[PDB]
């Protein structure tokens, strides 16, 4: 191999690749990036059986095509310390040479034959995503998902494709709370009418660093592959059946209150200084907040005026987990939110104001939560 | 007690005080701030036998004078979540009430009689510091000092007062390296001709957060007390005898090179990607840097042109610790530095260009380092 590349292009590519290396044992090929020069591109890839990323940068020049490998962490450590001028990469036996003017380095290469095959799939389902709605859904739902969940299928995010109705549902839950969204008017190409993909949390978080809009998503029911012009990402899927979240959603709600998002965030954080649970009291023109599981002798109270009177003929009391409530509000894009309730011992829902209104660019996430008793 | 205070004044005061609390066991008075209302001031103090801070803020109003205590971490957690409007603090039995409009809190107080006495000293030495030179010296020397040093006196920074010559010397060492500065034309008031104070590293780091210029420093040989208009800080001193650093400094140096600071930093970091030690080669118009304790098959080299020829008739080779060398350069305020050497196996010195030149506002730190063999 012998090429020259842009320092900043290379550094950026290496930064993305770090998350796909097992970096602690540098003597293992799992700590290495596979390199391949083909025509005017340098491809860099880091993968294992479970997950992987393949990227390219254009070469500034190319004298010799071929393949090699290099420790990804050391490679980035070197590049990040170099000048903003072009870098020469040239193989020399079992070794990769890096040169930039007066600076030169050598790093040992491993046998590229040991490097894992980067998978290709025969997709059963595919979508083209030309707006931020999918990663918006992912980012909004991620906090509810236990990565190290001890239950397999809940350790990931559900993507449920309905080809007939052209809707993709995105769901996360940790059994105390459940966040979901339904994305309509999605052009879904699928061999089956319905197909469900469960992406592991790690994959979710990596996707958020790599992608935003204008990418494809494809799956063969075993792997999911996401591609744009620069990147091809894959992840193994979680096998099994995600619980049907629809069966747990209440059919109707006795009461629905339209409330101020930022005032509630501010009030909940305030009581959270002394407790993890909060007693919320709703009156016609007031919202009261009191610390609930605070130590004896420690109390926090606050209230907020509600100018547009709630349909309440007598105080409604609701015990809530402060962190969950806050996270549900963080997932909302509107200045107001709707709190839908039945009995105080029953699950309640938090969602955007005008959730029913059609949106193009964004996902609207709703969160269903179990209350605290008393 | 009953007063009102400014939220931002209070929050700022509480932030400074956090470092002086043992925060993990909230049931201990060590986690508490002592409060005292005297006339139009609120004094807040956190201290133990070893170290402490006493601060004040002016009250916006004062209805009732008295004393109390409160958990400092909870207090700050509450205040930081409040609005930017005045806060009412009022004692109610064994409890402190905090009110801001619709928000109200209660926290339990402890018996103020258990709170440790804040010490006053009869100073044996005192200085008034009206320029940043002392904290500049402290900040520059701090990195060489082992806080958790297993040797008592080296676990702190030395302040050596010479009343006769009106000089204060500031020294830190960890036995591999030694950084020092001599501050001249300091008005020293002292009962003894010579007196040495050793401040613990923790105290050093706290001082850096609190003080910059226009403060007094006093010591009775047991405690050191630092005061400005807002703060009174104290620390117990480390007992014993700091080694005389003067006896270890070489008398003369065979060679002294004036070199580029930022070029050396950049070159050393570059080789540091692959090693912790570096072989430096000085020639008449070139400085060469090579990784030294890098793994087999991993190498890093770079060089820098030296336009103003060094007085060198044949290459000088010096083995150096990369981190120490970098830290010595970080402590310098000039664009160039002087490297003074004897034999390659002998200690060498790093200091500012024109170190001998008189400076008002700043400390000039020199670092003496043991080289690496080969």
Numbering used by the authors:
A (entry chain A), B (entry chain A): 1 to 374
Wording from the paper:
The sliding clamp is a ring-shaped protein complex that encircles DNA with the help of clamp loader in an ATP-dependent manner, and slides along the DNA. In prokaryotes, however, β-clamp is a homodimer, with each monomer consisting of three globular domains, and in this way β-clamp displays a six-domain ring. Although β-clamp is part of the DNA polymerase III holoenzyme, it is not attached to polymerase III permanently like the other subunits. β-clamp is loaded on the DNA, by clamp loader, a subunit of DNA Pol III. In both prokaryotes and eukaryotes, a key feature of this clamp-binding motif is the presence of hydrophobic amino acid residues that bind to the hydrophobic pocket in the C-terminal region of the clamp.
